[PDB]
């Protein structure tokens with residue numbers, strides 16, 4: 007008894023350019039499956055027309071992974087001259103007790119390193135400054151450096167919020183409700199890597215492994231420009 011996101015034409019293009027991974031990195035639904043009305047407790051259309059992702063457990067995910075319409079996985083030059091843009095309108099509900107960080111958008115390399123995660127966090131301390139209940143950008147410093155540069159982007163609201171990620175040349179920018187919150191951060195450490203976007207709910211370090219992380223997207227798209 008779940009309505010499919012494919013019933014809304016605003017999602018046709020991104021679904022055609024995606025596969026759905028749940029609850030780990032295994033694909034549960036390819037583009038053709040998603041367009042044919044795929045729906046489940048972890049991925050469905052709400053009555054007010056949000057695409058909702060929900061998942062429980064440590065490092066579990068309900069997430070779309072960027073694909074080409076050809077069926078090739080997206081694997082664009084992370085630092086190339088072609089711009090790659092992801093845009094989403096996201097409503098982040100108050101998270102259930104025990105949910106401590108939920109990744110909602112990513113730029114990931116074609117191996118094992120996230121270039122960028124945008125996530126909601128219960129708390130973060132950056133250079134001695136603790137912020138609570140915020141949306142955060144985390145950029146890994148390198149493939150062989152587990153550390154990352156972290157930037158608070160927004161105080162958490164439940165209101166629908168526009169996120170834009172713009173990747174071009176060796177630089178990455180993030181706008182939140184039209185305001186630049188990360189301005190051409192350097193990602194040259196991913197020269198020679200290929201990349202793709204992800205969107206959904208990726209549950210990071212929960213304290214209750216049975217609680218559900220839950221993220222709602224009113225719009226979502228990913229595009230190139232040449």
Ligand SMILES: O=C(O)[C@H]1O[C@@H](O[C@H]2[C@H](O)[C@H](O)[C@H](O[C@H]3[C@H](O)[C@H](O)[C@H](O)O[C@@H]3C(=O)O)O[C@@H]2C(=O)O)[C@@H](O)[C@@H](O)[C@@H]1O
Pocket residue numbers: 065120131144146152153154156210211
């Ligand atoms: O408060 C800190 O900044 C803290 O960060 C620690 O390394 C983090 C790293 O910053 C990053 O957030 C990473 O994120 C993971 C993510 O949790 C998830 O597993 C994803 O799939 O992979 C990401 C990744 O590895 O890039 O998690 C690291 C972590 O150890 O939790 C340390 O640098 C720590 O000393 C520091 O205080």
Ligand SMILES: O=C(O)C1=C[C@H](O)[C@H](O)[C@H](O[C@H]2[C@H](O)[C@H](O)[C@H](O[C@H]3[C@H](O)[C@H](O)[C@H](O)O[C@@H]3C(=O)O)O[C@@H]2C(=O)O)O1
Pocket residue numbers: 027030031032033071079112114116117118119120123208
């Ligand atoms: O999402 C992250 O931030 C992230 C960081 C962790 O350290 C892992 O690297 C984890 O990487 C995932 C990645 O997000 C993809 O889901 C990837 O999927 C590939 C796998 O080979 C799958 O088997 C799938 O069939 O093809 C996927 C693809 O490239 O699209 O898997 C890794 C991972 O779990 O190691 O995420």
